[PDB]
């Protein structure tokens, strides 16, 4: 069903936009569809959108679009109803398509991407109110819906998609917001991942755990500081790790992948 969503909205929409996490757009490009776009629907559009720009340093996202304007038009963006960024560039952008499709009497646009990226969120801050359902959990929107504005441009919100590539990951599916982290079996074992991603300094500030090594030890300093230990005297490995991995995805620890360098 979840790809039956996807071919539906692609065949439904005229211009597709494609959101991408600013933290690691390369981990989210998910080419795979653009392939189908070029070969079977040449008239359709496929523009990228960089949302969640407020989690990266200023120059970082600046470097990305220069590495992304060479192939796709790629707006940067920050979604919030009350304090956003870059809305009116997109509002200027869309109506041109309604302008160019003059005869077409109206026009759809569907929002494709990974789960937990802001596809539901972006439509809300377009409509300047809550219309999509949103959540910090990944799988929040479940089925596409029409959202009308200006009587010609229609917003469509498919649920998030992961392409079924073999590898290309097993654990970094956790390191995108894909999996609701609760149902996993051993959250203890992915902790050296976030040591490898996040910086030790910024990690040190958010807890405010002083000197450690050997990430199992890193957990056990924390559960003492939280007092989050079981009845005599088991330190919570799992739920603390479940609380850690949320903050890597809900955005309480700062991280990103370094953009490709200029030359």
């Amino acid at each position: 069903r979840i790809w039956n969503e996807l071919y539906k909205v692609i065949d439904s929409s005229d211009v597709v936009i494609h959101v991408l996490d600013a933290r690691d757009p390369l981990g989210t490009r998910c080419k795979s569809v653009e392939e189908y776009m070029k070969k079977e629907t040449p008239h359709k559009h496929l523009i990228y959108v960089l949302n969640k720009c407020d989690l990266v340093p200023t120059w970082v996202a600046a470097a990305w679009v220069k590495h992304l304007s060479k192939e796709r038009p790629t707006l940067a963006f920050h979604a919030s109803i009350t304090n956003s960024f870059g809305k009116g560039s997109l509002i200027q952008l869309l109506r041109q398509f309604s302008q160019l499709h003059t005869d077409r009497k109206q026009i759809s646009v569907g929002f494709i991407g990974y789960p937990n990226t802001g596809k539901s969120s972006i439509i809300n801050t377009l409509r300047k109110k809550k219309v999509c359902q949103v959540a910090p959990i990944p799988g929040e929107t479940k089925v596409w819906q029409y959202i009308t504005l200006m009587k010609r441009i229609f917003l469509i919100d498919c649920p998030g998609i992961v392409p079924p590539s073999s590898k290309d990951s097993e654990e970094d599916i956790l390191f995108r917001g894909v999996v609701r982290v609760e149902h996993v079996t051993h959250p203890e074992q992915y902790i050296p991942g976030v040591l490898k991603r996040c910086q030790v300094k910024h990690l040190e500030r958010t807890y405010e755990i002083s000197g450690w090594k050997d990430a199992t030890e890193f957990i056990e300093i924390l559960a003492r500081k939280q007092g989050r230990l079981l009845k005599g005297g088991e330190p919570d490995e799992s739920g603390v790790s479940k609380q850690i991995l949320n903050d890597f995805n809900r955005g309480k620890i700062p991280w990103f992948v370094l953009p490709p360098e200029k030359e």
């Binding site: 989690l55 707006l75 560039s89 500030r205």
Partner: peptide
Amino acid sequence: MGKQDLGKLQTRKMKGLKSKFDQG
């Protein structure tokens, strides 16, 4: 495309961005 400036956008002040909390 509209031209796009980044002199705006106060980025999200995470706690890990603040030097007020640090160890040493």
